[PDB]
Design a protein around this ligand. Structure first.
Ligand SMILES: O=C(O)[C@@H](c1ccc(OCc2ccc3ccccc3n2)cc1)C1CCCC1
Ligand SMILES: O=C(O)[C@@H](c1ccc(OCc2ccc3ccccc3n2)cc1)C1CCCC1
Ligand SMILES: O=C(O)[C@@H](c1ccc(OCc2ccc3ccccc3n2)cc1)C1CCCC1
Ligand SMILES: [Ca+2]
Lengths: 151, 144, 149
């Protein structure tokens, strides 16, 4: 329903979000599959490994999505989207590592890079805003100075 | 802060999201009610159910808004309202397996993909129209 | 990507969101550190379990927080929403620390406040929409009767 110009600024970010959704579903399926071989949080050693891995991924996901969209909207879409893809590859390798484990946190540098893009984007906005208001006051001061000349 | 036309494109999705928040709160309250009193069977049941609901919420929200913004608001919002009904019955039944509302999520995913495909069709058609006019403008240039 | 006018309507909410990201990272670091005193599991030392549960309680709440923060910020008014969001990050920090040395829920009133803002904004949208619809009908009713000059 949104306009053509807006969608073009977010389409790549949407694609990566949607792929991350497929991955979320894959992780969730692996939890379901290992639970079947009533649902509890405790069980077989194999189940607890998958459940933990999934939980570790779920915990970090809203953070990832927040920095993905911040970076993609405020800074530049392509690099953010590419880093978003890189995150998903790292997620996959992290999750598979538990199916043998790695620690609690993963993909620190990608989240950091996306966070850095978001800060760079906010600084960029303010540089343009202060430039715009500096240009506005410059015209308004001249208009008062040039005021008697045009009569 | 947003303008009238944009809010009209999200208002239904926003309402559905707010109802889910109330539902999230209700589940959380239910945990708190049992927490103050692998522990007790009663507490473990509510905590796990809530935990399963919380786990899937970001994904739900991602595909709800993707579908609503990229494809069409009404069907996405309605499917979202259906998720909340299914989710309520899933949580109450605990007091099933790990996953619920599988098909609604899939449907919202398919809407999003259909919306992206729709975007690309309009884009490539627009650039073709641009090139078409540019061609005739070059052909009928000297006749002016 | 986004235009200067739009960013201006979301910059404060973005800032509050990025600080919550830093806070989430801080909490996750607190889980990572205590997990190395222990293969990663959910159950272990009383020190690890308390930090893990604390983080988990915050993580359970976070998507609801973002939902109400942005709804309030975009549909009602940016400044108070971001301010309320910033208060949530303060209360949340007090919650996490105190948990290591409160129950499951925290920051209810801020969540409720951001929720009510969102509802208030939606109602405000419908007030302006129906007024704009009635104004459009009012001009049409005059135009159709004045048409024979
Ligand atoms: O397992 C299937 O059949 C699929 C599937 C699985 C789940 C779906 O949505 C529910 C859902 C979604 C995300 C969640 C995240 C955390 C916890 C539960 C969650 N639950 C839809 C399709 C997957 C198989 C290969 C990729 C998709
Ligand atoms: O007093 C109460 O129980 C209410 C309440 C409860 C919580 C609130 O926000 C914090 C919050 C929000 C969502 C969460 C999701 C998961 C875990 C904790 C969460 N924590 C606000 C009002 C509920 C009463 C019926 C519905 C709301
Ligand atoms: O620990 C570091 O060195 C940083 C760092 C950098 C990137 C991280 O991942 C993103 C992330 C964000 C939130 C999460 C929530 C739950 C599980 C994983 C999560 N993962 C984490 C920490 C900072 C953390 C606070 C001060 C240092
Ligand atoms: Ca969780």
């Amino acid at each position: 329903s949104l306009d053509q110009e807006t969608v073009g600024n977010v389409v790549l970010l949407a694609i990566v979000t949607l792929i991350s959704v497929v991955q979320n579903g894959f992780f969730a399926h692996k939890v379901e599959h290992e639970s079947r071989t009533s649902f509890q949080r405790t069980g077989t050693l194999a189940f607890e490994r998958v459940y933990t891995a999934n939980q570790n991924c779920v915990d970090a996901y809203p953070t990832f999505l927040a920095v993905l969209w911040s970076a993609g909207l405020l800074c530049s879409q392509v690099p953010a989207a590419f880093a978003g893809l890189m995150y998903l590859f790292v997620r996959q390798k992290y999750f598979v590592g538990y199916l043998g484990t790695p620690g609690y946190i993963f993909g620190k540098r990608i989240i950091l890079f996306l966070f850095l893009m978001s800060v760079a984007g906010i600084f960029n906005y303010y540089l343009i805003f202060f430039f715009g208001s500096d240009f506005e006051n410059y015209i308004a001061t001249i208009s008062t100075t040039i005021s008697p000349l045009l009569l």
